[PDB]
Swiss-Prot record, chain B:
Gene name linked to the record: prgH
Protein name: Protein PrgH
Membrane protein topology class: Single-pass membrane protein
Residues of the whole record sequence present: 171 to 392 of 392
Function: Required for invasion of epithelial cells.
Principal cellular location given in the protein's record: membrane
From Swiss-Prot, chain C:
Family under the similarity heading: Belongs to the FliQ/MopD/SpaQ family.
Compartment annotation: Cell membrane
Keyword Transmembrane helix: yes
Residue spans crossing the bilayer: 16-36, 53-73
UniProt topology in membrane: Multi-pass membrane protein
Organism: Salmonella typhimurium (strain LT2 / SGSC1412 / ATCC 700720)
Record keyword Transit peptide present: no
GO cellular component labels: plasma membrane
Keywords: Cell membrane, Membrane, Transmembrane, Transmembrane helix, Virulence
Protein name: Surface presentation of antigens protein SpaQ
Biological process (GO), any one: bacterial-type flagellum assembly
Organism ancestry: Bacteria, Pseudomonadati, Pseudomonadota, Gammaproteobacteria, Enterobacterales
From Swiss-Prot, chain D:
First and last residues shown, out of full length: 89 to 257 of 263
Localization per Swiss-Prot or TrEMBL: Cell membrane
Main location: membrane
Coiled coil: none
Family, per entry: Belongs to the FliR/MopE/SpaR family.
Summary of the function given for this chain in its UniProt record: Involved in a secretory pathway responsible for the surface presentation of determinants needed for the entry of Salmonella species into mammalian cells.
GO BP annotations listed: protein targeting
Protein name: Surface presentation of antigens protein SpaR
GO cellular component, one term: plasma membrane
Alphabetical keyword list: Cell membrane, Membrane, Transmembrane, Transmembrane helix, Virulence
Keyword S-adenosyl-L-methionine set for record: no
Membrane topology: Multi-pass membrane protein
Transmembrane helix is among the record's keywords: yes
UniProtKB/Swiss-Prot annotation, chain I:
Name by which UniProt lists this protein: Lipoprotein PrgK
Shown segment, full-protein numbering: 127 to 203 of 252
Domain of life assignment: Bacteria
Gene of this entry: prgK
Subcellular localization(s) per the UniProt record: Cell outer membrane
Function (record text): Required for invasion of epithelial cells. Could be involved in protein secretion.
Family according to the record: Belongs to the YscJ lipoprotein family.
Length: 184, 222, 84, 160, 184, 184, 184, 184, 77
């Protein structure tokens, strides 16, 4: 049992096993208490597993939000550091309200931020949105754009349909069978 | 042991050919598998003589011999799809060699490759080598300019191209070079800043006149 | 611009360095008189002015002609930067 | 006259903490106002001043009843004070620590006259601390607080 | 039984079990005291359950509201930092008030935030809304879009009937039968 | 008897039992002592009870009011934080007063809040109201909408009959019979 | 036998193993507790192993972000130090959002940095973007250059389609077989 | 058994060994723990080894970045020391983004620094970039120069195609065989 | 080795700043055509600054000396 990675946490280990089992190699999630988890594969599987670690850039990094760069524990907060914490909570709430449509499994929403308007007297520009989605397969994914552009349109001040872009896709094929132990 | 078991797990990406001078040639297919077989023969787990050959570099090796013992020869490419009988693509409209003179070249190229049995020399036309390059350059709808002269053609692609027209051009040049080789026709993709992608006119008193293709270009305000 | 920054860095430096010796010669004789008042108990708060007047007026006495050749050397330079 | 009132109010707090102004309860703030009137006047300056004055006739031409737009005028007093306080924030806190430490020095021996001992040194620390940030920080904020012609519609409207 | 997740709380574990039971695999909810819950699946049901964990991005994140970025215990509160709490409490109250209608199981409302139109001399912009809903099946869900618009029209200052977008749908099929243990 | 929920409230457990008993599955309000209440269902009814927990979003969140994030304990209070606390007590007292009418089981009232008019150069806008109601069945509930608009009309300064929207509905069917234990 | 690197990290060790196994030399990763990992090779493979360490510049440096050089612990914060930390989280969230597309294994996004335009009376310049990507092979990667352009277009204030430049490629040939032991 | 360099470290000793192994002389790396590495050669190889140390100027110095001369730990920071720290982080990030292209082993980017234009009324100048690259052999490296200029162009504000200069070269022939011990 | 012209007092007055000059030295490996490798160092150095000309750069380069490989030799007395 050659060790690939150790010290991974809970959510990082289930993505490594979900990636390795797709390419006919299996792993073992060994708990170690305070020292996190650990993932081991076999000896003929070690050469392929160290290839898919480098290719897929595993282990995954924790996802970044814009509200982490401007913490709410500061003494004074600028107007530039208050609309970035407001817009970062709006684009996190808009992608949680997109997973409650029918068919949708995941979503990501981006908003265009105002920067120079915080310090200047210039009027702000129009706000642009962009979204990604993953739909459960067998669904008519061509007609599902007219619902997301309608839902996203009048959730802000004034946008138009040429400034919203939705790029969505169906999910991958299901993996339901076991990989198989290396016999020699 | 034998050489074809000291290599990797699959015996499908390499090929072991017996040499006439008592050597053992290993026929790889790309550069990544060339260092895979050269590492084996370099660390020395084989008690006999062996060499690692390749289609790209033994086509460059016997082009150094060729422009010393047969200068002013018009030829294109040597194809190794069957490595015991290579095909020598010779030009038809630019050579003066007779039937007796082509057989001496066929034997003196056999003597440079000891693994080969016989080199089959065939003659291709010089106008179907540039017709396939122009019809392929027009099928991708790429702006270009052809410059005919004696002893070779040239295609020039200039302008402020976008990101799709670089990938469609670079995918076609590297697929044409594998078939013919860069001895006759050469592509000249280059990026500068003018929204007129290659063409340039001058304006006076009757309309527009198409200028000759030159090296100076008008920089574009837009 | 770089001379406007230099002339402002030197006017504050000359204020800092010309008010240096009279404000450290009136500090040791402000502290050692009170340290004498810590050994022998005295409750006269207006006492160390008698030494502070002699300290400042004797420090300004020996370095009287020295201040004139730092003010004149800086004042002649700044007008040459102004006019030329 | 928005960016010069900030530098004058900066000088009145630097000059107030070291002393020299308690005879009413200046000489230092006239130097920071004269310095900011030159460091504003070199790069740009009169170009953005007559640019504001020339864009004023493009929005508030006479016989159209322009007016100074009351609801942003009410925070104008607050803005200058806030800018001055943040700008002067180092020197006051350092002179406050010099007063806590000299107040702690009197609890070990009360026969010191520590009121007048601090009065000799606070005018040298208020110069030494401002020497470390006079050059890199102060000529930036005059070019930061300068009012430009792009914010005239937020301060002037028309009745007509 | 190899463990997938551990340390999850109550609301997360009843979402992971409700996702795995839809796809014909069993799950066990093990308590651990102050260390949260755990979830174990069988060995033939391990490769499928890791794939559905990766696909549905389980365990769920806590739902974000805009009032959490601007806490009330701060010493100074901006006018920008008080309209965000006022909008983020009406946005939750109309969401809790939509569930009391006839047929609605879940709902979500989105108000259009404006904060930069306050300090200037520009007039305030019109306010936009956007709502989602899930109805029980057997309902004519084309006629019930008109009274959600009638309820939402005059809960604010001045909206139009074309500045509101309601995207609603019926619930999924009921999962009532047991998954069933694998027979070996 | 597998456990479903724990750590709940007296009112949070009476909604879970009222939801599960509607769908022909029983529950047990097991007291846990100092922890709280806990609902345990039977083993054949566990799959259905997990699915109806996920669908109906149980346990219920505490209902929010607008005067909960502008508390009266701070030493200073803006006029923005005093008008939102006045209107949030008016929209609760009107809700308490609507339940004493003839036939109403429950009601909910919303008032349009005022934010920008305290400081902008505009006069404050008109007031908009919105009401929901649940009536006892047997009621001709087309005639009840003229007794609620008349009562809600002159309880404010000046509202019109176009600015009041009442959406009311009769209550559901009665649940009186017992669910029934699974025959095992 | 002979060591060539020691004191490496976890992610630094798997890159050296994945590089050396491509060029037919087998290395071994040994743990040393708090002193990191260590990598050894055999006797005839040492001469080639120093040559590929020197050529590929192994071990890899940690990757740099622009928000690392403007730390948030400083009590002063210039406007050049707040926009640079705002841009450096957008070009990491767009990079993490490109990896969830159909067939993308890795991606890297760059934004044009503008910090000194708002301090004077000059108008802000337009914003430019650039992207790289590695696609799974078998993909027609000439038609996917317009979905990244469509997604990246209206995620910012106002870009044109000339300012976005995406250049992407397919992944290399897979390494799956074992290197082989040097016999003597 | 005559030492020539001692007190080195890990990255410097693998450069001295990789230089001496190219010119047919052996080397031995002796670790000393806290005191660092040491390098000895044979006695017939000592006269040639001292000459190649003097020629290649070994041991190598650490690579210098512009952000080392302007550290973030200072108490105050000029705008010249903030734009130099911004540009020296973009200069390292584009260098790490060019090593992920198809075939590039190493790369180096240089950006034009500007100081004088930012303080006076004179407008800022155009931006110039210059890059170097090392390619895998067998590549037609005349067509690989246009993807780099397309990638490098609009990662900045306003550059032209003639203000960028790319110089690239194929790697040297591989060194895989052992030097050989000096017999006497 | 690379030298840059140090002009840093151009911001003191109201005059526009001067151009920037560069000069480089290099030692090449023996056997290389060192006449054609002078336009690559000039192209690489041309646009690493604001605006230089091609006659403000000077490249002076030279091949390396002959190798010293044999041992010196022990003296006799």
């Amino acid at each position: 049992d050659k060790d690939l990675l150790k010290g991974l946490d809970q959510e990082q280990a289930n993505e490594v096993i979900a990636v390795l089992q797709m390419h006919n190699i299996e792993a073992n999630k060994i708990d170690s208490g305070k020292l996190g988890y650990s993932i081991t594969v076999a000896e003929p599987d070690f050469t392929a597993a160290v290839y898919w670690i480098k290719t897929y850039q595993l282990p995954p990094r924790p996802r970044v939000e814009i509200a982490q760069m401007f913490p709410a524990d500061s003494l004074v907060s600028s107007p530039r550091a208050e609309k970035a914490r407001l817009y970062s909570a709006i684009e996190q709430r808009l992608e949680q309200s997109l997973q409650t449509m029918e068919g949708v499994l995941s979503a990501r929403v981006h908003i265009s931020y105002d920067i120079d308007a915080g310090e200047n007297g210039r009027p702000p520009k129009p706000v642009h949105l962009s979204a990604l989605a993953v739909y459960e397969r067998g669904s008519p994914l061509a007609h599902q754009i007219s619902d997301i552009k309608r839902f996203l349109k009048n959730s802000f001040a004034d946008v138009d349909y040429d400034n919203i872009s939705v790029v969505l896709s169906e999910r991958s094929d299901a993996q339901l069978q076991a990989p198989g132990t290396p016999v020699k | 042991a034998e050489l074809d078991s000291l290599l990797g797990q699959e015996k499908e990406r390499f090929q072991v050919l017996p040499g006439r001078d008592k050597m053992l040639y290993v026929a790889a297919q790309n550069e990544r598998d060339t260092l895979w077989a050269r590492q084996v023969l370099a660390r020395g787990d084989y008690d006999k003589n062996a060499r690692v050959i390749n289609e790209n570099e033994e086509n460059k090796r016997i082009s150094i011999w060729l422009d010393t013992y047969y200068p002013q020869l018009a030829y294109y490419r040597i194809h190794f799809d069957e490595p015991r009988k290579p095909v020598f693509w010779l030009s038809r409209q630019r050579n003066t060699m007779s039937k007796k003179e082509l057989e001496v070249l066929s034997q003196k190229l056999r003597a440079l490759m000891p693994y080969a049995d016989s080199v089959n020399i065939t003659l291709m036309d010089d106008v179907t080598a540039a017709g396939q390059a122009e019809a392929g350059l027009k099928q991708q709808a790429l702006p270009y300019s052809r410059r005919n002269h004696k002893g070779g053609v040239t295609f020039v692609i200039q302008g402020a191209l976008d990101d799709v027209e670089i990938l469609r051009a670079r995918q076609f040049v590297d697929s044409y070079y594998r078939t013919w080789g860069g001895r006759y026709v050469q592509f000249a993709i280059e990026l500068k800043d003018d929204w007129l992608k290659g063409r340039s006119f001058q304006y006076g008193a009757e309309g527009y006149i198409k200028m000759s293709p030159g090296h100076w270009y008008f920089p574009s305000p837009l | 611009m770089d001379d406007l920054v230099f002339a402002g860095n030197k006017a504050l430096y000359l204020v800092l360095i010309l008010s240096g010796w009279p404000t450290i010669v009136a500090t040791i004789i402000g502290l050692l008189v009170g340290l004498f008042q810590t050994v022998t108990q005295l409750q006269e708060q207006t006492l160390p002015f008698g030494i502070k007047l002699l300290g400042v007026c004797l420090c300004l006495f020996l370095l009287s002609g020295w201040y004139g050749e730092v003010l004149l050397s800086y004042g002649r330079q700044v007008i040459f930067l102004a006019l030329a | 006259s928005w960016p010069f009132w900030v530098m004058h109010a900066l000088g009145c707090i630097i000059d107030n903490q070291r002393g020299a102004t308690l005879s009413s309860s200046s000489e230092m703030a006239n130097f920071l106002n004269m310095f900011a009137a030159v460091v504003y006047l070199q790069n740009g300056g009169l170009v953005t001043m007559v640019d504001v004055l020339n864009k004023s006739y493009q929005l508030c031409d006479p016989m159209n009843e322009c007016t100074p737009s009351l609801p942003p005028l009410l925070t104008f007093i607050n803005q200058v004070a806030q800018n001055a306080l943040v700008l002067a924030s180092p020197v006051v806190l350092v002179l406050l620590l010099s007063e806590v430490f000299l107040g702690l020095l009197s609890r070990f021996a009360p026969q010191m006259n520590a009121f007048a001992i601090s009065l000799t040194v606070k005018s040298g620390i208020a110069v030494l601390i401002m020497l470390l940030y006079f050059s890199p920080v102060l000529p930036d904020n005059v070019l930061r607080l300068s009012f430009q012609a792009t914010g005239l519609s937020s301060w002037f409207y028309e009745r007509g």
